Amino acid sequence: SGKRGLAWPWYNSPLDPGVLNNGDGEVVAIYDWETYAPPTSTGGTGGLGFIGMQGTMDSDSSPVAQLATRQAQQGWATVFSLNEPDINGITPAEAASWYIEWVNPLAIKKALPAVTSSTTSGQGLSWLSEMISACAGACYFDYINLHWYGTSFAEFQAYIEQAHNQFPSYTIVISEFALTNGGNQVAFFESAFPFLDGLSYVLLYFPFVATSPALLQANDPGAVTTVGTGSCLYTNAGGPSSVGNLMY
Ligand SMILES: [Cl-]
């Protein structure tokens, strides 16, 4: 059981997820922030298990009325829910009620919404604790879902240990993580992979981001400002980058 997965944007039709699957089983999963199949150069997912994701309450691209049908047609083993509701003006009670209505009926493994690493009350893990209070046992889930961006491996380690200390019986997936712009992304992931591989309560982790610098600059310039291009798992030619090599 590897834990590694691809955070695979909507704009990745040029790239092949199989490039980061060398058959040694470290890379096992792919998600694309949507409920439609990853856009790839191969028509497949390179042997990786696709995890659907209802990242907004409803969108043109992931209409929530189609969430059950898409899961059934595509046979996901796992589904992810809202993307960073903690900073997008969704109340813990609104999320709980939407989650019970729309996600609960998918009879597979389920993740509560991805929250940010914010220490603010009503954001991050505080927002998540308030959503779990609102659910009061009525949200069916398997995982909690973390994001992290910061400036040091030490801060990242402290944050995952803090999440485990708050939710010690919970299983964690890390759907997005990298250093902010200027950090040495290679040194970070070289620390972070063996650390996360050693935690029995972390099931999956997805470096931000399994694309190329050119596609991230073309489609997501805000991400290039925030993270730079050093965390892109792909090269501009579709090969593995210095960070992609760490995935094997
Ligand atoms: Cl974060």
Side-chain angles (χ1 to χ4, degrees):
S1 292
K3 307 195 179 181
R4 295 172 191 161
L6 306 194
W8 186 273
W10 62 261
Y11 49 77
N12 266 16
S13 64
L15 298 185
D16 177 3
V19 159
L20 293 173
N21 182 359
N22 72 357
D24 290 337
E26 287 287 2
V27 184
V28 294
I30 176 164
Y31 88 101
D32 62 14
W33 287 271
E34 302 290 343
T35 61
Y36 61 79
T40 75
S41 64
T42 63
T45 56
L48 305 180
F50 177 57
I51 301 184
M53 171 160 164
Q54 187 68 50
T56 65
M57 283 190 293
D58 190 34
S59 70
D60 290 345
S61 57
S62 289
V64 72
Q66 305 317 317
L67 174 57
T69 302
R70 281 172 183 198
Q71 182 280 313
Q73 296 160 330
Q74 298 173 49
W76 313 329
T78 310
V79 58
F80 291 166
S81 60
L82 301 174
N83 201 59
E84 304 188 349
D86 58 307
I87 58 158
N88 284 293
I90 296 173
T91 68
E94 286 167 347
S97 151
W98 175 97
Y99 186 98
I100 291 160
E101 186 173 356
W102 295 109
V103 187
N104 264 20
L106 274 68
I108 53 159
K109 299 282 189 194
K110 302 181 265 306
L112 287 188
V115 306
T116 71
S117 64
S118 174
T119 65
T120 312
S121 175
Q123 299 184 349
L125 290 177
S126 169
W127 182 98
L128 182 64
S129 178
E130 295 170 352
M131 188 199 168
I132 290 165
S133 198
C135 285
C139 299
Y140 295 164
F141 65 95
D142 303 282
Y143 316 128
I144 53 165
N145 191 333
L146 307 181
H147 293 178
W148 186 90
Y149 299 94
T151 55
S152 79
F153 169 65
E155 168 196 358
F156 173 72
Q157 174 167 353
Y159 184 67
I160 294 309
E161 285 171 344
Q162 161 184 41
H164 177 60
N165 283 348
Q166 292 197 33
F167 304 98
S169 53
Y170 288 41
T171 303
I172 289 165
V173 305
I174 306 164
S175 68
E176 300 184 8
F177 74 119
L179 295 188
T180 64
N181 205 336
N184 174 344
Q185 300 278 16
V186 169
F188 172 78
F189 292 117
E190 275 177 351
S191 289
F193 291 10
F195 164 75
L196 295 175
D197 285 356
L199 306 179
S200 59
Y201 58 87
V202 174
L203 190 66
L204 300 169
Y205 57 81
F206 302 75
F208 188 81
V209 55
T211 195
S212 68
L215 290 169
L216 188 74
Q217 181 51 63
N219 293 293
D220 197 0
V224 171
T225 303
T226 297
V227 171
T229 57
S231 72
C232 290
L233 298 190
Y234 284 93
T235 73
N236 280 352
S241 73
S242 297
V243 174
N245 276 335
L246 295 177
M247 300 282 287
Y248 296 125

